């Protein structure tokens, strides 16, 4: 089906506690495959998925150089942003950047992404045309002008349409037994009396990959959006994810409720009920 590659950079200043930390992690879909941390005893790009290990020393050296250079550049950028906002040298600040490429089920480039945030607020983003910028404010307008002057968009576009897709396609082939395998959720409904006249029905989805899933409750075939407690999808630690949806129902009315489950790994969408 569809696939993406993303790198996520986080650069965090910490005045009085050394120079800003730079961390980079790389993902294919919901699978992390590399990390780099400037605070590590000996900072180097390290593998985080078995299928990347087969890459040669040149790969690791090249990546490590890129991230070491980025460490320095992001420190400059933090200094620069502090200035753009007239901020004190006393506070900690964070730049985040995410970029990468999306492929459709045919392996074609669907779109590219390059987005940044400052202190968790959108700062600047490469537009879907991979040619123009959206700046959030007059500070980001300075970065925009700087990047417009240095032809940054053209460089990001070439990567996103080229290297990004080429390496994503390589990784997808090298890791095809996991990356191109959808594990369906194992699903069940639990029942927990809350009082004499109400009970919680909880619909569980366990052991699925990728993370994308839809879990809903219906009452008489109508969605219970407002009355459903839906927890955030959470990692199990073995690559898979877990989720549940719960509804409080009148005692005796349990069979009017249906849990509906959609996920890529399923031969067909599931309808479950509580089974006493």
């Amino acid at each position: 089906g569809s696939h993406s590659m993303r790198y996520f950079y986080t650069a965090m200043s910490r005045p009085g506690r050394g120079e800003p930390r730079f961390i980079a992690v790389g993902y294919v879909d919901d699978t992390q495959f590399v990390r780099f941390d400037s605070d590590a005893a000996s900072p180097r790009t390290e593998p985080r998925a078995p299928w990347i290990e087969q890459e040669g020393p040149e790969y690791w050296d090249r990546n490590t150089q890129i991230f070491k250079t980025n460490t320095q550049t992001y420190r400059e950028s933090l200094r620069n942003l502090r200035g753009y906002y007239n901020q004190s040298e006393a506070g900690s600040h964070i730049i985040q950047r995410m970029y990468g490429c999306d492929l459709g089920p045919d392996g074609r480039l669907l779109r590219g992404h390059d987005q940044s945030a400052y202190d968790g607020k959108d700062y600047i983003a490469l537009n879907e045309d991979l040619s123009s910028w959206t700046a959030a404010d007059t500070a980001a307008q300075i970065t925009q002008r700087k990047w417009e002057a240095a032809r940054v968009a053209e460089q990001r576009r070439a990567y996103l349409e080229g290297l990004c897709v080429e390496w994503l396609r390589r990784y997808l082939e090298n890791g095809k037994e996991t990356l191109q395998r959808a594990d369906p959720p194992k699903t069940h409904v639990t029942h927990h009396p809350v009082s004499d006249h109400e009970a919680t029905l909880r619909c569980w989805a366990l052991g699925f990959y990728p993370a994308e899933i839809t879990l809903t409750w219906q009452r008489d075939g109508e969605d219970q959006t407002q009355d459903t407690e839906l927890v955030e999808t959470r990692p199990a630690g073995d690559r898979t994810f877990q989720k549940w949806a719960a509804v409080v129902v009148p005692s005796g009315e349990e069979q009017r409720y249906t849990c509906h489950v959609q996920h890529e790994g399923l031969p067909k969408p599931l309808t479950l009920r509580w089974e006493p």
């Binding site: 990546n63 600047i124 970065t143 700087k146 460089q155 990567y159 290297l163 390496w167």
Partner: peptide, 11 residues
């Protein structure tokens, strides 16, 4: 594979 160092443009 990440985006090449290129020219490193700082923000």
């Amino acid at each position: 594979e990440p985006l090449p160092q290129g020219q490193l443009t700082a923000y």
